[PDB]
Every structure is written in C-alpha cells, then in structure tokens.
Amino acid sequence: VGSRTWCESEMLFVQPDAGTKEELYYRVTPKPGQTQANFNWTPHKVRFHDARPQRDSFDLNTHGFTFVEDAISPQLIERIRADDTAAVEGDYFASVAALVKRVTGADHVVCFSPYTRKENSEKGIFGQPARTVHCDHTPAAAIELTHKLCGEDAVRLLQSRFRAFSVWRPLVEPVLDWPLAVVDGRTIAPDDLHPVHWLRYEKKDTEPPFQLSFSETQKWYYLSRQRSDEVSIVKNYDSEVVPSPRSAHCAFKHPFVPKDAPPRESIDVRCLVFGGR
Ligand SMILES: COC(=O)[C@@H]1C(=O)C(C)=C2O[C@@]3(C[C@]2(C)[C@H]1C)[C@@H](C)CC[C@H]1C(C)(C)OC(=O)CC[C@@]13C
Ligand SMILES: O=C(O)CNC(=O)C(=O)O
Ligand SMILES: [Fe+3]
C-alpha cells in the first residue's frame, strides 16, 4: 500500500476506448431527465512516487512539470482564503506572472481563470479538489484562449514559443490529503488523451480539455507534505517539440493521513506563456 518513497491510491480516468465513437461530453449540473454524459468515469489504482527526494530535478521540458520555491506573505494567503477577488486578480496574478518569468524567462505572461479550492467546499466542483485525471487544455483550447485573451496580438504572439501552465499553490500547509499528482509527460501515450466537453451550460461554450485513460506506462508523482512556499507548475500545452509536450494532473485520497485531518485548501491559476526557454 505504501513504502518509503511512494504510496498507492486511486484516481478517476476515462476508458481507453472513450472518444473514438463520438465527441465526449459531461454536464456539470444536469437537469432532471437530462443525460449527464456519454461515458463513465473509471477509477484505477495508481502508484504515486514521492517527488520530495528528487524535488529539484523535475523540468518543464523534460517532465512537463516543476516544483519551485516561492514564498508569499501570510497576509496575501489569508486574503485569498477569504475569497478576496481583488487580492487574487491583482497581487496574486502579479506574483504568478513574476514567478513564471523567473522560471522560464518568458517575455509575456497572462493569468486567467483562478480557482480557490477547499476539501468539501460549498462553491461547487470547481472549488473542490479535482478527482478526474486531466490536462486543462487541448491544443484547440489553448489557441482559442490566446485569441480570447490577447485579441489583436494573438497572431503576433503565436509566432513565438507558446505554453500554457497551471500554477498550483497550497493555502494551508502542509498538504496531507488530496495532494495534486502529476505525471511524467514522456510517459503519456497519444492514446491516453481524450477530449471531453465540460458543459457548465446547456450547450458547448469553449474548446475542451483532455481527460486521460490509465496506462501502466504512466509514471505518476506527488510532492508529499507540500507547503505554501512550494509551487507546482504543470504544463498544459507547449508549441515547441520537447520530451514532454504536456503533463497531466489530478488529486487522490492519501491512504496514510488521519481521517480527521483538516481540509486541503489551495489556489491554482492558469497562464498563457509567450517566449522563454
Ligand atoms: C472538476 O473540473 C476539473 O477537474 C477541471 C477543473 O477544475 C477546471 C476548473 C477546468 O476548467 C475547464 C476544464 C477543467 C480543467 C476541469 C476538467 C472548464 C471546466 C472551465 C474552464 C475551461 C477554460 C479555462 C475555459 O479553458 C478550457 O480550455 C476549457 C476547459 C477548462 C480549463
Ligand atoms: O487543485 C486541484 O485539485 C486541481 N487543480 C487543477 O486541476 C489545476 O491546477 O489545473
Ligand atoms: Fe487542472
């Protein structure tokens, strides 16, 4: 069930055949009588290798994710936990942009779609830990988001290196239950990716993310006891040919934490990244 540098748990994948018949969709809030989806979630046992022994060796180009040290003020943390929208869109956005610039040397970072999450929150499934394995954007979604958020500069910006990141930070520390797991992007096969339209409304409103199916080739990681100063940067898209075109991420129930542990809290924001290495 567990060892010194790894443990076992479960995450919700999709079937390895899913999406070959027709386009997959999932309704967030189906009305009574409305079919919620044309596919089933399927849990699968996964071995989560602790990244803590090798924390600094993980790379956005090689693995598709990285862990970086970046302390922010306690006052900003409590403002974020207090659902201060101005604190998120102002100071924290600026924090995330500066961090990504530090890490990648990019010329321009655009933050969007912040999500503050709490174990068994009351803000819905997007304010709660993610239980389905996913990559936030397909190529079509990352490209669309660039036009949506950059307007006239989109074509100019897309002539250079274009990446999309999920930047994840714990709000209470250390993270024990429901940590954010990440997979080595070199161990994702093309057949593991399945676009799924997430219908927050009646009809499809954007381009879709990827959901993953399980493979034994996948090498899954987590950073045990992650602290508020340890930031996870997970690559959702990359326009350059690198060993990891993308990573994927999801949370899992840790089998060795007390039942009465306090709820996991965190904030993740997405960002478009132009330039850099
Ligand atoms: C429990 O839901 C999750 O596990 C994930 C999640 O928590 C969130 C917040 C999501 O945002 C998505 C899809 C995911 C990754 C889901 C799968 C949808 C639901 C709304 C915002 C869009 C958007 C920003 C317009 O960009 C898109 O490319 C379309 C897909 C996302 C990224
Ligand atoms: O925090 C979680 O459980 C899930 N987070 C994400 O999917 C993300 O950062 O894109
Ligand atoms: Fe995500």
Numbering used by the authors: 2 to 278
The publication says:
In this state, loop II takes the same open conformation as that in state I but the electron density of the side chains of Ile126 and Phe127 on the loop I was not clearly observed, indicating that the conformations of these regions are still not fixed. In the X-ray crystallographic analysis of NvfI, we obtained three different conformations of active site (state I–III). In this binding mode, C-13 of 2 is located close to the iron-center due to steric hindrance between the A-ring of substrate and Glu208, and then the direct hydrogen abstraction from the C-13 position by the ferryl species occurs.
NvfI from Aspergillus novofumigatus IBT 16806 is an endoperoxidase that catalyzes the formation of fumigatonoid A in the biosynthesis of novofumigatonin.
